[PDB]
């Protein structure tokens, strides 16, 4: 709003500048000097006021390029952040994006974004794989964690400790390849069900 007010204000104030003539008002010049000597002063006044109008049109087209870059960016945030869900980081704002609430504002728009940021952290012990019968086990979703006693499986985004099972891991490779593999016991849920049967 300040660039339009300052642009219109300069655009009006240039009429008060004389631009090399006797006076800025055309009635004092046309009411005194004769028309043939006066036409030279009129051509200097038109050319000066003309240069101010072409200067104004060039600044408006240049400012039109920034308002169009911001408008296309607003349409991009409007598309990704509001209607759907954008997985881009630091696009819809800091944190993992969820939803955006648009709000009307004079000569623009304000976006209220709902983000997910973690708060409390705790140091854990990790291993890339679990060695049980001699063949390796890798996590299907998440990473391996331990509190110093038993190895747990949990997601990277939040802590939900789970017992190592066959559905939480997948069998690939062996124990002599992966660097950092640890030995533990993989729980098989079929065993107590068959013992009870």
């Amino acid at each position: 709003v300040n660039q339009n007010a300052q642009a219109l204000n300069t655009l009006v104030k240039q009429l008060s500048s004389n631009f090399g003539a006797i006076s800025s008002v055309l009635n004092d010049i046309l009411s005194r000097l004769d028309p043939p000597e006066a036409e030279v002063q009129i051509d200097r006044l038109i050319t000066g006021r003309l240069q101010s109008l072409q200067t104004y049109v060039t600044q408006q087209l240049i400012r039109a390029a920034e308002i169009r870059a911001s408008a296309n960016l607003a349409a991009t945030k409007m598309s990704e952040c509001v209607l759907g869900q954008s997985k881009r980081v630091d696009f819809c704002g800091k944190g993992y994006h969820l939803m955006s609430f648009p709000q009307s504002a004079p000569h623009g728009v304000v976006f209220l974004h709902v983000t997910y940021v973690p708060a409390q952290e705790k140091n854990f012990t990790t291993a890339p794989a679990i060695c049980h019968d001699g063949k390796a086990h890798f996590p299907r979703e998440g990473v391996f964690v331990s509190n110093g006693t038993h190895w747990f499986v949990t997601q990277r985004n939040f802590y939900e400790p789970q017992i190592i099972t066959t559905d939480n891991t997948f069998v690939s490779g062996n124990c002599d390849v992966v660097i950092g593999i640890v030995n533990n016991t993989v729980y098989d849920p079929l065993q107590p069900e068959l013992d009870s049967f």
Binding site: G20, P118, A119, F138
Partner: protein
Amino acid sequence: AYSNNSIAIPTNFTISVTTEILPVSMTKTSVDCTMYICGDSTECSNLLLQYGSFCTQLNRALTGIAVEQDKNTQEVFAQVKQIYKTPPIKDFGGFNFSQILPDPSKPSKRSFIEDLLFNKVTDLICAQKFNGLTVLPPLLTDEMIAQYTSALLAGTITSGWTFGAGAALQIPFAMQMAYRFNGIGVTQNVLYENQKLIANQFNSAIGKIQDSLSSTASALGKLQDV
């Protein structure tokens, strides 16, 4: 080839590192209207003041350029307000980052790659200030922009994707590539079994990028054009 029953799955891969050169800001210059007409004379001031506010609008315009040029570097160079440091004991799982990491033994903090980037682009600032074009220095000096880069590198080596979206969460880089392969559709079996081969692929790729920047000086021509 085109067949309904035919399919191709890759049995091997390679890690390529490229270079894209994007200019950020240019040197900020502001030229005064009265001295550009002439100095030490009232004839330039009386006839130039007779044209009104042209100096003021062109001066406020060049000042507006210099402020936005500091703001573009502020929205790009510094993403986070927290400084991250590189630990002295380095075990990355077989990767050698010493080329891309800054060298503390140098008087100014820069990496081995930034040492070549500063040398391949051609005081001149005071020389331009001698003819009446004033070059205003940037708010962020070369050591702090390089410190922003070293902070962002140290965060990617240690914290990974966490510090961008929140508090920095420490993760080992050997497990970090497991998530980066799981994001692109590659099983982490490729990482854990071929990690020794990937270490030699990455270290050779960094040596080839360093050789391309050292032998070919026209790769920085995007900034040389500016």
